[PDB]
Scaffold this active site. Structure first.
Site, PDB file in Angstrom:
ATOM      1  N   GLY A 120       0.352  -1.077   0.051  1.00  0.00           N
ATOM      2  CA  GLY A 120      -0.190   0.054  -0.267  1.00  0.00           C
ATOM      3  C   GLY A 120       0.993   1.293  -0.038  1.00  0.00           C
ATOM      4  N   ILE A 121       0.687   2.090   0.608  1.00  0.00           N
ATOM      5  CA  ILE A 121       0.972   4.135   0.474  1.00  0.00           C
ATOM      6  C   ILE A 121       1.300   4.142   1.695  1.00  0.00           C
ATOM      7  CG2 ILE A 121      -0.132   4.488  -2.135  1.00  0.00           C
ATOM      8  CD1 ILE A 121      -2.168   6.090  -0.783  1.00  0.00           C
ATOM      9  N   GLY A 122       2.078   4.976   1.600  1.00  0.00           N
ATOM     10  CA  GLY A 122       2.250   5.447   3.262  1.00  0.00           C
ATOM     11  C   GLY A 122       4.323   5.117   3.411  1.00  0.00           C
ATOM     12  N   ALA A 123       4.273   6.044   4.764  1.00  0.00           N
ATOM     13  CA  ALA A 123       6.431   5.939   4.678  1.00  0.00           C
ATOM     14  C   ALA A 123       6.508   4.472   5.529  1.00  0.00           C
ATOM     15  CB  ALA A 123       5.951   6.501   6.236  1.00  0.00           C
ATOM     16  N   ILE A 124       5.302   3.986   5.902  1.00  0.00           N
ATOM     17  CA  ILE A 124       6.099   1.953   5.613  1.00  0.00           C
ATOM     18  C   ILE A 124       6.568   1.591   4.766  1.00  0.00           C
ATOM     19  CG2 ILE A 124       4.986  -0.229   6.914  1.00  0.00           C
ATOM     20  CD1 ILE A 124       3.846   1.306   8.619  1.00  0.00           C
ATOM     21  N   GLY A 182      -8.787  -4.750   0.442  1.00  0.00           N
ATOM     22  CA  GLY A 182      -8.555  -6.653   0.083  1.00  0.00           C
ATOM     23  C   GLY A 182      -6.991  -7.367   0.311  1.00  0.00           C
ATOM     24  N   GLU A 192      -2.991  -4.269  -5.689  1.00  0.00           N
ATOM     25  CA  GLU A 192      -3.986  -3.680  -5.057  1.00  0.00           C
ATOM     26  C   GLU A 192      -4.049  -2.060  -6.181  1.00  0.00           C
ATOM     27  OE1 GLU A 192      -7.345  -3.482  -1.443  1.00  0.00           O
TER      28      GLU A 192
HETATM   29  S1  LIG Z   1      -6.570  -1.352  -1.700  1.00  0.00           S
HETATM   30  C1  LIG Z   1      -5.799  -1.507  -0.437  1.00  0.00           C
HETATM   31  C2  LIG Z   1      -6.485  -0.655   1.063  1.00  0.00           C
HETATM   32  N1  LIG Z   1      -6.723  -1.434   2.117  1.00  0.00           N
HETATM   33  C3  LIG Z   1      -6.551  -2.181   2.550  1.00  0.00           C
HETATM   34  O1  LIG Z   1      -7.383  -2.897   1.439  1.00  0.00           O
HETATM   35  C4  LIG Z   1      -6.843  -2.768   3.933  1.00  0.00           C
HETATM   36  C5  LIG Z   1      -7.303  -1.635   5.133  1.00  0.00           C
HETATM   37  N2  LIG Z   1      -6.318  -0.521   5.623  1.00  0.00           N
HETATM   38  C6  LIG Z   1      -6.086   0.257   5.556  1.00  0.00           C
HETATM   39  O2  LIG Z   1      -7.191   1.308   4.895  1.00  0.00           O
HETATM   40  C7  LIG Z   1      -4.928   1.154   6.008  1.00  0.00           C
HETATM   41  O3  LIG Z   1      -3.700   0.573   5.278  1.00  0.00           O
HETATM   42  C8  LIG Z   1      -4.900   1.219   7.745  1.00  0.00           C
HETATM   43  C9  LIG Z   1      -5.092   0.051   8.202  1.00  0.00           C
HETATM   44  C10 LIG Z   1      -6.123   2.155   7.999  1.00  0.00           C
HETATM   45  C11 LIG Z   1      -3.729   2.238   8.127  1.00  0.00           C
HETATM   46  O4  LIG Z   1      -2.710   3.091   7.331  1.00  0.00           O
HETATM   47  P1  LIG Z   1      -2.801   4.917   7.310  1.00  0.00           P
HETATM   48  O5  LIG Z   1      -1.218   4.615   8.128  1.00  0.00           O
HETATM   49  O6  LIG Z   1      -2.534   5.707   7.321  1.00  0.00           O
HETATM   50  O7  LIG Z   1      -3.864   5.066   8.846  1.00  0.00           O
HETATM   51  P2  LIG Z   1      -2.919   5.096  10.343  1.00  0.00           P
HETATM   52  O8  LIG Z   1      -1.999   4.416  11.132  1.00  0.00           O
HETATM   53  O9  LIG Z   1      -1.708   6.679  10.761  1.00  0.00           O
HETATM   54  O10 LIG Z   1      -3.374   5.640  11.612  1.00  0.00           O
HETATM   55  C12 LIG Z   1      -5.175   7.561  11.214  1.00  0.00           C
HETATM   56  C13 LIG Z   1      -5.265   7.493  12.211  1.00  0.00           C
HETATM   57  O11 LIG Z   1      -5.357   7.110  13.398  1.00  0.00           O
HETATM   58  C14 LIG Z   1      -4.819   6.551  14.782  1.00  0.00           C
HETATM   59  N3  LIG Z   1      -4.814   5.347  15.520  1.00  0.00           N
HETATM   60  C15 LIG Z   1      -4.283   4.370  14.507  1.00  0.00           C
HETATM   61  N4  LIG Z   1      -4.301   3.358  15.266  1.00  0.00           N
HETATM   62  C16 LIG Z   1      -5.083   3.047  16.273  1.00  0.00           C
HETATM   63  C17 LIG Z   1      -5.748   2.166  17.542  1.00  0.00           C
HETATM   64  N5  LIG Z   1      -5.501   1.030  17.291  1.00  0.00           N
HETATM   65  N6  LIG Z   1      -6.633   3.284  18.530  1.00  0.00           N
HETATM   66  C18 LIG Z   1      -7.220   5.272  18.540  1.00  0.00           C
HETATM   67  N7  LIG Z   1      -6.080   5.486  17.522  1.00  0.00           N
HETATM   68  C19 LIG Z   1      -5.596   4.899  15.982  1.00  0.00           C
HETATM   69  C20 LIG Z   1      -3.951   7.446  14.947  1.00  0.00           C
HETATM   70  O12 LIG Z   1      -3.442   8.256  15.453  1.00  0.00           O
HETATM   71  C21 LIG Z   1      -3.703   8.335  13.028  1.00  0.00           C
HETATM   72  O13 LIG Z   1      -3.624  10.043  12.917  1.00  0.00           O
HETATM   73  P3  LIG Z   1      -3.709  10.963  11.962  1.00  0.00           P
HETATM   74  O14 LIG Z   1      -3.040  12.288  12.281  1.00  0.00           O
HETATM   75  O15 LIG Z   1      -5.089  11.286  11.142  1.00  0.00           O
HETATM   76  O16 LIG Z   1      -2.673  10.648  10.764  1.00  0.00           O
END
Ligand SMILES: *SCCNC(=O)CCNC(=O)[C@H](O)C(C)(C)COP(=O)(O)OP(=O)(O)OC[C@H]1O[C@@H](n2cnc3c(N)ncnc32)[C@H](O)[C@@H]1OP(=O)(O)O
Ligand SMILES: *SCCNC(=O)CCNC(=O)[C@H](O)C(C)(C)COP(=O)(O)OP(=O)(O)OC[C@H]1O[C@@H](n2cnc3c(N)ncnc32)[C@H](O)[C@@H]1OP(=O)(O)O
Lengths: 427, 427
Positions: free
Chosen positions: B209-213, B330, B232
């Site tokens: 996917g996209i992002g820093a990781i 997905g 994807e």
């Molecule tokens: S077609 C491919 C798309 N994806 C899939 O098929 C599978 C589903 N996954 C996704 O949409 C993303 O890969 C997910 C799982 C959301 C991870 O992506 P992001 O990297 O973009 O989001 P962040 O990890 O940076 O989180 C956004 C905000 O929410 C807070 N946060 C994360 N995890 C938690 C938990 N467990 N509890 C409370 N809060 C949590 C973060 O602080 C984060 O802050 P932002 O300021 O909004 O960035």
């Protein structure tokens, strides 16, 4: 070059300490051999026993075996639940179809496989009988095999065949196969049976489990025709529809004209029917439970059950909270394959309540730590004694609304409340 | 016979009240048209807009549209989260690969599809460009199509082609495509990138996917070779490894020598690379995200992320409790296909903490109502800035132990406690 033992204990003796063992599962559980191990193991230690659902092996769950043997379950059963909940046994979540791969890929080693087979024929060929499942794969990678020859084990057709020279030891004696008749008719079961029956179309390729619900469903299909069978297992319920001509596997594309399963469980009449029957094929779970194969048959009808379902459609069917009850099995693969199949439909059937009617199986939210077996996106139909709910493509508020409509009326009010207070949905 | 509109408002005008609309998603979101609908819709009502992740469509989330238009999300985004959480929009959980089927099977009707395409060629053929996803399927069943012709939309290869006579209306103007550069390097990302990088073998068929990781991971693969791509989506990260020769799709069996995806998102250099590039194939998500197809390539390497993971391995990645954050997407299909693939591996990569480091992503139990996207049985690897944990075939106590070892040390003590107090496991 197999050693013809004169007693079960003599056969089990080859097992040495620290070994990882595998046991034939389901109706094939080598009780005769496992009882002898209940004693021999007392002289060993660090013995791990990999398994699936087992029958009549409660002797191996006796406290005296603690420290000598430990159960490693891919699927829990009656004799293991108390041990899993008490942290004396280990539960390994895994799709049933993935078990053969875990063995073949060498990820999980097996020093010896305990199995129960039919006597060897003129060619020295034996059969895994009513349980092929993942034992065939276990016998492939097992360091050594200890077989129990039972004239009662039916010579099933399919992949259950294995040559007696692949055995390190062999003990022969006629024993009884668990008939398993724990099921029992009920008012709720009948109701659910009727609802599901209305979703079943002629020419449908069935897939079901054992119990009152499945039976009630089968009893309402005596009017359909050209039904097929491609399931994880089957019982007497199916046998009755076969003799009625209702089932003929004429509309299947994968192994047409024949019944296909990973195993069987039921009365002696069933075991008699599958015994050396060209029309019944016991196939390896790596295939029978392979979504890629299941989708090959049009109009697949997958009917499974569950323990708890939330207002959103998340299905829990392997446990109650953090206490493991059974296992992942293969309801998910069948539910997905069913969706991929042309005109296929799946259904999660369960009583609206439990524990005497004080606990709602349809909860606003899953209990802390509940094991999710089938996810939201997977679900298609969910039936209860109060009707059916179609969640396919439905939003969260649509799903919650439909679900509370089939939940027991004594919980509608609560469910409806948490629909807004917990999920923030307004119906 | 398409109508050549002189303004976006003229094109959107055909939309009538009560209609169910579909919009090109991701980088292809028809902002030019959607902004015109932000006004035209003010004169309509009962307008439902089906969609996936959208970009630059925050004008349609303005309070002024309440009562006229409502969003129906298969996947949430920045402009929809506040509406979903506030119960003003609807979230429909569904596998991405299942969306095309929902449309084609006629289960979900679509009156009109709003799309953005490249200008027609000598043959009158246009391209869905950087987003094929499920829009192709939507254009198939849509009652009418309203297209925005943008000379900036690259002419992608694959299934994104469509003839202009299939359009009811057409408005042409060059507009900017969302470059999406919200990502940003970090200390944790680098750490996770390094750990994942060690799991990647040469000749592996990547999916990310996209992002820093993901970027950090890609930056650590500049030493590998013969890497393939079947994902994807992809961004600039991949583009860099391609020009390095590290990626050549030589070891794939399904569409070898070519990159495959459902869509793309990144800088103008990326859109420039995919533009009319025979080596890059944008395929329909019904195929690219089909486990049956993904498993065809050996050594698949599926790397995805998550929001919250429990000590047992249950993965939540579409929401935080009962509040929907994104969607199923997905990742599951890719994680399963990766397990089915020969020598395939999957990995769920996420920061050990969140919210500034006060919330542990690895919780003893999932938050009440947490959406499970990937189940226990699915998980293979889970990586954090503190290492990796292999849950494949591991028991509950083994899983919990490994997980707490990669969890942030500020929560080890708590996690370890609830390991026995909540799950009844003794490590
Ligand atoms: S077609 C491919 C798309 N994806 C899939 O098929 C599978 C589903 N996954 C996704 O949409 C993303 O890969 C997910 C799982 C959301 C991870 O992506 P992001 O990297 O973009 O989001 P962040 O990890 O940076 O989180 C956004 C905000 O929410 C807070 N946060 C994360 N995890 C938690 C938990 N467990 N509890 C409370 N809060 C949590 C973060 O602080 C984060 O802050 P932002 O300021 O909004 O960035
Ligand atoms: S190859 C086929 C194997 N299986 C799969 O692929 C899928 C997994 N399926 C299963 O394990 C069974 O189908 C399940 C989902 C358990 C349903 O089967 P059962 O019909 O055999 O079990 P019961 O419904 O009868 O339940 C047994 C005891 O547990 C209590 N109980 C049920 N539901 C709940 C909830 N939600 N909360 C608290 N307790 C619950 C019942 O009281 C029941 O009591 P018993 O006295 O044990 O009979």
């Amino acid at each position: 070059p197999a050693i013809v033992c004169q007693s079960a204990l003599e056969a089990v003796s080859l097992i040495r300490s620290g070994e990882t063992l595998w046991t034939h599962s389901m109706g094939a559980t080598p009780k005769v051999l496992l009882d002898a191990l209940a004693k021999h193991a007392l002289t060993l230690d660090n013995i791990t026993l990999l398994q699936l659902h087992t029958e009549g092996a409660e002797s191996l769950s006796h406290p005296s075996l603690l420290g000598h043997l430990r159960h490693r379950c891919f699927f829990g059963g009656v004799p293991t639940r108390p041990l899993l909940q008490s942290g004396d046994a280990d539960y390994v979540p895994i799709f049933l179809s993935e078990v053969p791969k875990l063995f073949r890929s060498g990820e999980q080693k097996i020093d010896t496989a305990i199995i129960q087979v039919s006597p060897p024929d003129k060619h020295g060929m034996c059969s895994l009988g009513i349980s092929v499942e993942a034992t065939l794969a276990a016998c492939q990678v097992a360091g050594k095999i200890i077989a129990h020859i039972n004239p009662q084990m039916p010579r099933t057709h399919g992949d259950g065949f294995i040559h007696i020279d692949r055995f390190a030891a062999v003990y022969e004696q006629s024993a009884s196969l668990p008939i398993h008749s724990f099921a029992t008719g009920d008012a709720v079961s009948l109701a659910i049976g009727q609802h599901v029956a209305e979703l079943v179309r002629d020419g449908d390729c069935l897939q079901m489990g054992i119990g009152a619900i499945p039976d009630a469903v089968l009893s309402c299909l005596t009017g359909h025709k050209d039904l097929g069978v491609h399931t994880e297992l089957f019982s007497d319920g199916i046998l009755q529809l076969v003799e009625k001509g209702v089932i003929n596997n004429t509309k299947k594309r994968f192994y047409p004209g024949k019944l296909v399963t990973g195993f069987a469980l039921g009365s002696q009449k069933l075991y008699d029917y599958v015994d050396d029957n060209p029309a019944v094929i016991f196939m390896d779970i790596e295939q029978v439970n392979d979504t890629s194969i299941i989708r090959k048959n049009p109009n697949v009808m997958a009917i499974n059950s569950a323990l708890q379902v939330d207002l959103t459609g998340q299905v829990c069917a392997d446990s109650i909270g953090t206490k493991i009850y059974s296992g992942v099995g293969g309801q998910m693969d069948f539910i997905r394959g069913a969706g991929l199949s042309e005109g296929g439909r799946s259904v999660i059937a369960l009583p609206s309540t439990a524990a005497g009617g004080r606990i709602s199986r349809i909860a606003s939210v899953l209990s802390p730590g509940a094991g999710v077996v089938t996810t939201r996106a997977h679900v298609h139909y969910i039936v209860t004694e109060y009707g059916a709910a179609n969640l396919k493509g439905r939003s969260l508020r649509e799903r919650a609304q439909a679900l509370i409509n089939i939940a027991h009326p004594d919980f509608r009010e609560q469910l409806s409340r948490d629909a807004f207070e917990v999920w923030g949905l307004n119906l």
